[PDB]
Paper text:
Here we report the discovery of a new family of DUBs, which we have named MINDY (motif interacting with Ub-containing novel DUB family). Found in all eukaryotes, MINDY-family DUBs are highly selective at cleaving K48-linked polyUb, a signal that targets proteins for degradation. Our structural analyses reveal that the catalytic domain of FAM63A is a distinct folding variant of the superfamily of cysteine proteases. Collectively, our analysis of human MINDY-1 reveals that it is a chain-trimming enzyme, which uses the Ub-binding MIU together with the catalytic domain to cleave K48-linked polyUb chains from the distal end in a stepwise manner.
Residue numbers in the entry: 111 to 181, 185 to 369
The structure:
């Protein structure tokens, strides 16, 4: 959380910085910031090696406050900026994220969602309930995750056996989809993402910087272990869980 290592890479033919972490924390700061660095919206002095949160925060503050309104939600805009600013300091420490299983862009709104929306950064997750299993669909339905854990507990202590049944139908779905990415999710997520756009991907209380390229998904390699490995930049998100290929800045294969 204190200091982060900067990694310089040849992004779109220009030396561009990227921020690394070994810690694997639940801070979306780096996910958001790396997107901004990749879009050249923040620039660092060429020599830079290490960076603090307070700099990144500063850079982010300026970035949000420098957004000119450009066509739609008017009184919302000004509240969203104020919402973004009030929650801005939380982005360093960590964040509760309550997904919904109804679609890849679906969360319970908290004001931290304003920062993504202001900056035009999509937030996605892959924890989707399958249409194929329609008992789980019925049991989960409208509910978000933290609502589903409440209802599961409520369903245990019900005397009605219908509810107690569904309380297990749902408790199954979380047990079977424990790694928070279903195959149905990965398909829907791929189709959803705009080719060559940067976005943030949520899974197991981690935020990753994501993009789509030749209609395949890749995540940025935040890992500090590959700090020296300039040729290791993107990692494929082709399978639901397992083996994955690494790529350089231009999406060509690479090895260590
Ligand atoms: Hg959020």
């Amino acid at each position: 959380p204190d200091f982060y290592c900067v990694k310089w890479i040849p992004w779109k033919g220009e030396q561009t910085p990227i921020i690394t972490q070994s810690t694997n924390g639940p801070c979306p700061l780096l996910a958001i910031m790396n997107i901004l660095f990749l879009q050249w919206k923040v620039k660092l002095p060429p020599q830079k090696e290490v960076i603090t949160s307070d700099e990144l925060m500063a850079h982010l503050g300026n970035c949000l406050l420098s957004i000119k309104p450009q066509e739609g939600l008017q009184l919302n805009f000004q509240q969203n900026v104020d919402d973004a600013m009030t929650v801005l300091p939380k982005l360093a420490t960590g964040l509760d994220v309550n997904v919904r299983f109804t679609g890849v862009s679906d969360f319970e709104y908290t004001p931290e969602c304003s920062v993504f929306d202001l900056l035009g950064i999509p937030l996605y997750h892959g924890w989707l309930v399958d249409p194929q299993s329609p008992e789980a669909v019925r049991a989960v339905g409208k509910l978000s995750y933290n609502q589903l854990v409440e209802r599961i507990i409520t369903c245990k202590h019900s005397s009605d056996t219908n509810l107690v049944t569904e309380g297990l139908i749902a408790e199954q779905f979380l047990e079977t989809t424990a790694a928070q990415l279903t195959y149905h999710g990965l398909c829907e997520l791929t189709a959803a993402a705009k080719e060559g756009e940067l976005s943030v991907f949520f899974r197991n209380n981690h935020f990753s910087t994501m993009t789509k390229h030749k209609s395949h998904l890749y995540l940025l390699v935040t890992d500090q272990g590959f700090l020296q490995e300039e040729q290791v930049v993107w990692e494929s998100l082709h399978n639901v869980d397992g083996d994955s290929c690494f790529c350089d800045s231009d999406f060509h294969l690479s090895h260590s």
